[PDB]
Amino acid sequence: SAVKAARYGKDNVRVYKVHKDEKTGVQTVYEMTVCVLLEGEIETSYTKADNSVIVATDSIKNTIYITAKQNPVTPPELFGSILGTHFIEKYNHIHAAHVNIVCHRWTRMDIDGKPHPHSFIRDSEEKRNVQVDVVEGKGIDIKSSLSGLTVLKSTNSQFWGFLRDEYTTLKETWDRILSTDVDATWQWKNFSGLQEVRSHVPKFDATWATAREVTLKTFAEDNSASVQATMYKMAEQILARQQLIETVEYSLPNKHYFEIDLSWHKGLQNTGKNAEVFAPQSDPNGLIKCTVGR
Amino acid sequence: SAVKAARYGKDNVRVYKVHKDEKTGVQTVYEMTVCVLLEGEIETSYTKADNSVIVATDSIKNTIYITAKQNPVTPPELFGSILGTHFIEKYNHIHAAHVNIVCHRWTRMDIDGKPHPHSFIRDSEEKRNVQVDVVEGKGIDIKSSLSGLTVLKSTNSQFWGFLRDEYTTLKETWDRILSTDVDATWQWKNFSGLQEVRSHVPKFDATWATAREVTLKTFAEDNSASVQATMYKMAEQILARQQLIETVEYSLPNKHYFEIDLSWHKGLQNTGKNAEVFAPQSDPNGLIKCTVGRS
Amino acid sequence: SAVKAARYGKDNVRVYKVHKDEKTGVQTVYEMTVCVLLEGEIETSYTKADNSVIVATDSIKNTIYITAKQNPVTPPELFGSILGTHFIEKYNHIHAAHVNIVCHRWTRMDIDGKPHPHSFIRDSEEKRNVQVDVVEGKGIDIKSSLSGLTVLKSTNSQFWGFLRDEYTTLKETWDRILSTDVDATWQWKNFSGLQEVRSHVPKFDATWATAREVTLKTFAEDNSASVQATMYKMAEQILARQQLIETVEYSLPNKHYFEIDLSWHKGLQNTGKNAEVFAPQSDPNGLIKCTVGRS
Amino acid sequence: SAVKAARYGKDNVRVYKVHKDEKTGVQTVYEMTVCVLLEGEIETSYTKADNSVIVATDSIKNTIYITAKQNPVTPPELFGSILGTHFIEKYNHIHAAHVNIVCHRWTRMDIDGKPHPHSFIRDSEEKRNVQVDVVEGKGIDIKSSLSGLTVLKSTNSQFWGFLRDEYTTLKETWDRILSTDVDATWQWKNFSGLQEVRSHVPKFDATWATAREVTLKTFAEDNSASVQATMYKMAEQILARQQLIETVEYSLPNKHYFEIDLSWHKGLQNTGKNAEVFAPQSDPNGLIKCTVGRS
């Protein structure tokens, strides 16, 4: 037997950084959860119990705080690159650093129509994330994403014309409720190293803010033929909106709302065009993914 | 041995209701989870295994669906009152109905700067809840609440002057991060029945909006001397603002962010005035609560 | 406006304690999550913002560890009493102490049929808990419980004879799956103080073992007319076996498993007597509660 | 732009199957959660909004139910094999079926030491799972696994000899607590089809039992030099006991238990050799993985 692959690191490293402005005095908060996983010539730590090759996971935790203190934590794509670069460079047996970051929302409150200097709110469980893979002599592979963005449309969604057979009981429909938790991932074209990345910094927040706007918009305006049809259109606009991005991935759970036939009760009309009260279903759920390249 | 207390019903009934405007075409969604426990002359289903006094939890479910269909579902205070009342009246062996509604946010999307007709977003895990207790001959007791409201302030919070002894190790501070999850409940004056409740409908949505606002506002403005202090303030304004509330209750789990001393690394300064990077703590957590009533 | 009530303390305090036997060499681990909520003359911390009367929540955290260090942490009923007692005795303005304890399972592994000396496994998400209320001159109130004990029986459960009306669609059944999460609580007779508690220490683990025992058996053996009937039975046995317990509370979720009519597909028989494959429902769920006391 | 990848299906499909033995009487439950994503000539549904290619996820759900009702459901590798197969065959345009199955523990209850015929307990949150990719013309690929296995050992674990530098502050140790959640996956060599799988059936349940046993025992015995070192040993014995296993993957979150210095209080000694009370840490946590194939 033999170590085909190995990675080890620290997970769930929760970090919080505050930016205090002098003139304005206005503070900015950033909170994230980090996980670094290392790779390289370390087999011996598994095979023969050699801890000499092991950089302690506590050390990595130490490193993460240290870095966040010396560098800017935003945007996640940068910070994750600065982070993952360090590891491969400060150590010789360390060839690949895998950085996952999850940004949490700390929106600035508006008290009395005016933005507040130092009071924030978790205005959603939606996260902004980066998977940054830093390889020695292969540059930095970034994958940005947005997740947990939960949406719902009360109509203007349809589902018919699907294959029918001896396992089909679903009835075609022209007016259904459409709900999902959006998971969108846009991969960036390989970066030489940190230098290329810093050069594109502004492109990151803009591409995330774009992907978000497209998703929302396209969700709401598309007279959905299917979830499939709606993702591709979503993808499309993103690609077309950014040359750097190489691909776009969407994984969407089709969260079902079922009509309730109340007709057994005083001939109550609650189906079809009379549908008012539905039963959201926790499960099962539809899952539909798809990667969109050029 | 004897049945000292009993209640049964149905929990986690997910309900979704759509309202369509024929004119504008603007649809409006509502989603809640409902729990109805019923109390009554039911000892016999426990002691003699007598199911004839039982109204199947299934039927309670159906009832919830029908009631949502034939009635307005907002404000939750109203719906809950209609729903609980039905059971005490429909059934003679049932004398109390306990109703719990958790309202889920489905805020309308803002596409291109314009409120979309039929598109919403879950803009927060925050919830609006109501606990309606309906007792035959004792009116309707309503507690209204907001929960899941997570806040954080990077400064303007202190904690010094607390009792020190041989169990203390907590260094006083004049500046600290203050984050918490807000659980605030306001309890309305007992209501005689559905009628008096309908009489005050507009008040509910308003009082809730007030309570929220009063909570963010105070939290953000107050130069906190202690979570206990900031809290009381919030309660105060709430009572002063609504005559109908008999009591306000706040439950605050203060979530700690610890500074990380990095002096051991190239003398890096990261505490006190030079504190930038902190480490949020999942546990433990302080837990402060209090009930403010009227004089 | 006035502070009708206030409590505060520390929540979610994880504690782990090991017991190393010199002779045997065998080790015994204990893990739990603790919460202490304090009460007393502490309004001025809310009203006048006076941190003088505030024992810092952090100091409560310290106190927990310290206490856990000088005393045994098992049984929880005792540990909780010692800890609650301390606070009321150590502080004059502190009159009531509320202590909650959730004990996690770390069951000793059996390797090769023998009980390993220092290797444990979490063999259930089942908890054993205690809510101990220590009040100045009112004694110690102890509520012992188990929770998160998930069970199922594929037959020997029925539900029929229930009330049927225009809201009823549930078909009577003489055979169904029954699955619930057991939440069971037994309230001990009040205790003067720490001494009386220490005197009954052997009764605790005993009574919890019994409660667990009686719950499992009765759930397995009973041909269930209703979940209510079965739960009342199980409370009875518990009150009989232990005189110190004044009341027993059960709260059970009736997790439904639905039949799947597959007839529409090649006349496949899956319902009634032919039922093999079912659809466990995440929700909603029946919720049946009941507190059984002494006649 | 174009469609580089696309999969679609049904997720979280709860299934429960009962087996009734007419002779003995002994009933036997199985409960699982299936997810089935399909791949094939379906690009059009995304680009040309043509649902003619789409086999409604609902039908997948129905398919799953029927399938479970017409076949045996254990061992998961068989069922998921039958199930993924069915979709490639029945549908020309579908050329890959990815089937996930999570098996839920329903362990037979022991009432008065005698195994009950129809009663069960979720004796753990441990899960047996299988991932079964079935590609048309590339046999059946089957990764087996066990997850949610939570263990802890009070001693016989050390960690010293690691690299130290200006980032290090971790003290070496010759005795520490080791606790993790074991995630162990063992891949099977590619199988030609449903007939080869069916062939080996008996291997499945047995390998799984071995993987647990190897895991359990090794963890409990190995005087651990590093998590890394103890894992590798496990992988070894697994690959050894089964020539059908192409690789073994272990994912182990190292859950930390910190010492609590209490010297500040009456010089209480709670560190090193006198460490009794510890603070379990929810986060962060070391995460150690590694795949072990053959030479």
Ligand SMILES: Nc1c([N+](=O)[O-])[nH]c(=O)[nH]c1=O
């Ligand atoms: N960093 C590591 C630790 N550690 O505690 O940091 N323990 C291990 O078994 N392995 C590691 O790599």
Ligand SMILES: Nc1c([N+](=O)[O-])[nH]c(=O)[nH]c1=O
């Ligand atoms: N509603 C009830 C049901 N039921 O299924 O609706 N089953 C019981 O055992 N008890 C109930 O009260």
Ligand SMILES: Nc1c([N+](=O)[O-])[nH]c(=O)[nH]c1=O
């Ligand atoms: N212990 C307390 C803290 N604290 O941080 O320990 N903060 C508060 O606002 N109040 C307390 O009582």
Ligand SMILES: Nc1c([N+](=O)[O-])[nH]c(=O)[nH]c1=O
């Ligand atoms: N099965 C599908 C459904 N459906 O509801 O079953 N809806 C979609 O948009 N897409 C599907 O593939």
